[PDB]
Amino acid sequence: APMGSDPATACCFSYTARKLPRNFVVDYYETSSLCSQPAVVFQTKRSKQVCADPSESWVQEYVYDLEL
Ligand SMILES: [Zn+2]
Ligand SMILES: [Zn+2]
Ligand SMILES: [Zn+2]
């Protein structure tokens, strides 16, 4: 899951290989450009924080859905 728990500095070294159901995703943040790779981290109803590849369409669609 990300290394660290502060959205300002936590980094992802892998991405989820499963699609998260929209009904279980409740929040997100973007990882810092200081991290080795870009990532969105989604928080879920099971209290997980899940790294995801921002180049995937569904990740972008969920981010807009949460933000706006
Ligand atoms: Zn939040
Ligand atoms: Zn779409
Ligand atoms: Zn904001």
Tab-separated table of N, CA and C and ligand atoms in Angstrom:
chain	number	residue	atom	x	y	z
A	1	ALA	N	1.013	-1.216	0.000
A	1	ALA	CA	0.000	0.000	0.000
A	1	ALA	C	0.988	1.186	0.000
A	2	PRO	N	0.613	2.480	0.214
A	2	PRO	CA	1.763	3.391	0.055
A	2	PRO	C	2.758	3.249	1.201
A	3	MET	N	4.034	3.529	0.955
A	3	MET	CA	5.007	3.667	2.083
A	3	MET	C	4.881	5.064	2.691
A	4	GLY	N	4.520	5.145	3.993
A	4	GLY	CA	4.239	6.403	4.706
A	4	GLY	C	2.732	6.612	4.749
A	5	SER	N	2.261	7.505	5.636
A	5	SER	CA	0.784	7.775	5.689
A	5	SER	C	0.385	9.231	5.523
A	6	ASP	N	1.372	10.084	5.249
A	6	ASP	CA	1.042	11.479	5.034
A	6	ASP	C	0.897	11.720	3.524
A	7	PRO	N	-0.298	12.079	3.067
A	7	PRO	CA	-0.477	12.333	1.645
A	7	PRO	C	0.553	13.282	1.010
A	8	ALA	N	1.154	14.165	1.795
A	8	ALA	CA	2.115	15.101	1.267
A	8	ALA	C	3.404	14.421	0.844
A	9	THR	N	3.689	13.251	1.420
A	9	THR	CA	5.010	12.624	1.205
A	9	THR	C	4.996	11.109	0.930
A	10	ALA	N	3.872	10.431	1.221
A	10	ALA	CA	3.806	8.981	0.989
A	10	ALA	C	4.000	8.586	-0.498
A	11	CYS	N	4.677	7.443	-0.754
A	11	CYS	CA	4.934	6.998	-2.161
A	11	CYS	C	4.455	5.570	-2.443
A	12	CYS	N	4.097	5.296	-3.706
A	12	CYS	CA	3.627	3.949	-4.120
A	12	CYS	C	4.672	3.292	-4.960
A	13	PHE	N	4.992	2.034	-4.649
A	13	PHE	CA	5.989	1.318	-5.462
A	13	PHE	C	5.326	0.261	-6.268
A	14	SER	N	4.022	0.059	-6.083
A	14	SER	CA	3.238	-0.785	-7.022
A	14	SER	C	1.832	-0.211	-7.183
A	15	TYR	N	1.135	-0.670	-8.199
A	15	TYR	CA	-0.250	-0.256	-8.445
A	15	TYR	C	-1.177	-1.450	-8.278
A	16	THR	N	-2.407	-1.199	-7.872
A	16	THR	CA	-3.395	-2.255	-7.799
A	16	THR	C	-3.586	-2.890	-9.143
A	17	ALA	N	-3.696	-4.216	-9.154
A	17	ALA	CA	-4.072	-4.896	-10.368
A	17	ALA	C	-5.545	-5.246	-10.414
A	18	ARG	N	-6.387	-4.718	-9.543
A	18	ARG	CA	-7.793	-5.062	-9.644
A	18	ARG	C	-8.444	-3.720	-9.769
A	19	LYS	N	-9.633	-3.676	-10.371
A	19	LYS	CA	-10.402	-2.389	-10.387
A	19	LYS	C	-11.201	-2.257	-9.115
A	20	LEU	N	-11.152	-1.083	-8.491
A	20	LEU	CA	-11.925	-0.875	-7.290
A	20	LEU	C	-13.365	-0.517	-7.661
A	21	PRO	N	-14.347	-1.200	-7.058
A	21	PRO	CA	-15.730	-0.795	-7.262
A	21	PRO	C	-15.918	0.644	-6.781
A	22	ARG	N	-16.654	1.429	-7.577
A	22	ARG	CA	-16.865	2.850	-7.223
A	22	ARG	C	-17.555	2.968	-5.891
A	23	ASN	N	-18.466	2.047	-5.583
A	23	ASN	CA	-19.202	2.171	-4.291
A	23	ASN	C	-18.329	2.003	-3.052
A	24	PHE	N	-17.136	1.427	-3.191
A	24	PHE	CA	-16.255	1.307	-2.035
A	24	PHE	C	-15.131	2.387	-1.936
A	25	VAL	N	-15.002	3.241	-2.944
A	25	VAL	CA	-13.949	4.262	-2.902
A	25	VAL	C	-14.532	5.547	-2.314
A	26	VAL	N	-13.834	6.152	-1.337
A	26	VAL	CA	-14.453	7.286	-0.637
A	26	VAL	C	-13.568	8.542	-0.628
A	27	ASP	N	-12.292	8.431	-0.979
A	27	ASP	CA	-11.397	9.598	-0.912
A	27	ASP	C	-10.190	9.276	-1.774
A	28	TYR	N	-9.378	10.282	-2.054
A	28	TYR	CA	-8.144	9.998	-2.763
A	28	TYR	C	-7.117	11.092	-2.391
A	29	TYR	N	-5.850	10.817	-2.768
A	29	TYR	CA	-4.854	11.850	-2.934
A	29	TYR	C	-3.865	11.454	-4.019
A	30	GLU	N	-3.138	12.466	-4.491
A	30	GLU	CA	-2.047	12.251	-5.478
A	30	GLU	C	-0.731	12.198	-4.749
A	31	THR	N	0.169	11.279	-5.130
A	31	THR	CA	1.464	11.266	-4.493
A	31	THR	C	2.390	12.352	-5.057
A	32	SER	N	3.337	12.767	-4.225
A	32	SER	CA	4.322	13.819	-4.518
A	32	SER	C	5.186	13.478	-5.714
A	33	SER	N	5.611	14.518	-6.450
A	33	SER	CA	6.564	14.353	-7.545
A	33	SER	C	7.907	13.918	-7.002
A	34	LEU	N	8.170	14.027	-5.700
A	34	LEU	CA	9.434	13.463	-5.145
A	34	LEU	C	9.530	11.901	-5.155
A	35	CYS	N	8.352	11.235	-5.242
A	35	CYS	CA	8.276	9.757	-5.311
A	35	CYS	C	8.825	9.234	-6.629
A	36	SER	N	9.217	7.978	-6.632
A	36	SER	CA	9.855	7.422	-7.826
A	36	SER	C	8.888	7.248	-8.955
A	37	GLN	N	7.612	7.059	-8.636
A	37	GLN	CA	6.581	7.002	-9.709
A	37	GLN	C	5.261	7.699	-9.366
A	38	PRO	N	4.526	8.169	-10.395
A	38	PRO	CA	3.262	8.886	-10.143
A	38	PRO	C	2.192	7.879	-9.611
A	39	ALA	N	1.287	8.338	-8.765
A	39	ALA	CA	0.270	7.452	-8.267
A	39	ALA	C	-0.848	8.266	-7.664
A	40	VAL	N	-2.053	7.721	-7.787
A	40	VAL	CA	-3.223	8.148	-7.019
A	40	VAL	C	-3.451	7.083	-5.896
A	41	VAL	N	-3.748	7.520	-4.681
A	41	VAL	CA	-4.002	6.584	-3.606
A	41	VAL	C	-5.463	6.731	-3.206
A	42	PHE	N	-6.232	5.680	-3.382
A	42	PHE	CA	-7.685	5.723	-3.045
A	42	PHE	C	-7.926	5.117	-1.669
A	43	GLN	N	-8.779	5.753	-0.890
A	43	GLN	CA	-9.159	5.222	0.405
A	43	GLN	C	-10.490	4.476	0.193
A	44	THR	N	-10.643	3.362	0.904
A	44	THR	CA	-11.821	2.503	0.709
A	44	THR	C	-12.617	2.308	1.978
A	45	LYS	N	-13.795	1.762	1.799
A	45	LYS	CA	-14.669	1.547	2.951
A	45	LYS	C	-14.137	0.521	3.962
A	46	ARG	N	-13.213	-0.356	3.519
A	46	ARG	CA	-12.512	-1.282	4.402
A	46	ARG	C	-11.286	-0.619	5.014
A	47	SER	N	-11.207	0.719	4.918
A	47	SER	CA	-10.122	1.465	5.535
A	47	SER	C	-8.755	1.209	4.935
A	48	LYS	N	-8.712	0.758	3.692
A	48	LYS	CA	-7.459	0.626	3.007
A	48	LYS	C	-7.060	1.875	2.244
A	49	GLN	N	-5.776	1.990	1.928
A	49	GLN	CA	-5.291	3.014	1.072
A	49	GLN	C	-4.646	2.274	-0.079
A	50	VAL	N	-5.139	2.495	-1.289
A	50	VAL	CA	-4.770	1.627	-2.422
A	50	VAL	C	-4.155	2.440	-3.510
A	51	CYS	N	-2.918	2.117	-3.864
A	51	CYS	CA	-2.239	2.736	-5.018
A	51	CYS	C	-2.784	2.350	-6.348
A	52	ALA	N	-2.876	3.342	-7.237
A	52	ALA	CA	-3.448	3.119	-8.557
A	52	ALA	C	-2.766	3.948	-9.594
A	53	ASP	N	-2.701	3.391	-10.822
A	53	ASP	CA	-1.979	4.022	-11.940
A	53	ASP	C	-2.818	5.154	-12.561
A	54	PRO	N	-2.350	6.403	-12.455
A	54	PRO	CA	-3.135	7.555	-12.911
A	54	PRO	C	-3.280	7.576	-14.424
A	55	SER	N	-2.578	6.700	-15.122
A	55	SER	CA	-2.788	6.658	-16.547
A	55	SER	C	-3.991	5.815	-16.952
A	56	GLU	N	-4.546	5.047	-16.024
A	56	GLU	CA	-5.808	4.290	-16.267
A	56	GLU	C	-7.033	5.182	-16.279
A	57	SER	N	-7.934	4.960	-17.225
A	57	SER	CA	-9.064	5.837	-17.417
A	57	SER	C	-9.908	5.896	-16.179
A	58	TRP	N	-10.174	4.739	-15.620
A	58	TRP	CA	-11.070	4.675	-14.466
A	58	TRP	C	-10.509	5.434	-13.280
A	59	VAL	N	-9.172	5.481	-13.169
A	59	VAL	CA	-8.594	6.249	-12.032
A	59	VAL	C	-8.892	7.733	-12.180
A	60	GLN	N	-8.693	8.262	-13.393
A	60	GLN	CA	-9.055	9.657	-13.674
A	60	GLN	C	-10.550	9.941	-13.483
A	61	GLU	N	-11.417	9.018	-13.916
A	61	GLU	CA	-12.844	9.244	-13.853
A	61	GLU	C	-13.177	9.303	-12.372
A	62	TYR	N	-12.562	8.430	-11.560
A	62	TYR	CA	-12.957	8.437	-10.110
A	62	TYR	C	-12.474	9.665	-9.421
A	63	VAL	N	-11.264	10.115	-9.761
A	63	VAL	CA	-10.747	11.357	-9.187
A	63	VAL	C	-11.630	12.535	-9.468
A	64	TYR	N	-12.042	12.716	-10.714
A	64	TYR	CA	-13.007	13.823	-10.964
A	64	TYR	C	-14.294	13.670	-10.174
A	65	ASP	N	-14.782	12.434	-10.065
A	65	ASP	CA	-16.054	12.145	-9.363
A	65	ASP	C	-15.920	12.531	-7.903
A	66	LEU	N	-14.788	12.221	-7.308
A	66	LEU	CA	-14.573	12.569	-5.871
A	66	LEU	C	-14.358	14.069	-5.665
A	67	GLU	N	-13.605	14.674	-6.572
A	67	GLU	CA	-13.134	16.072	-6.357
A	67	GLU	C	-14.251	17.070	-6.588
A	68	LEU	N	-15.072	16.814	-7.594
A	68	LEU	CA	-15.992	17.804	-8.084
A	68	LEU	C	-17.431	17.505	-7.761
B	1	ZN	ZN	-9.165	13.215	2.064
B	2	ZN	ZN	-15.460	7.723	-18.972
B	3	ZN	ZN	-8.668	20.110	-2.751
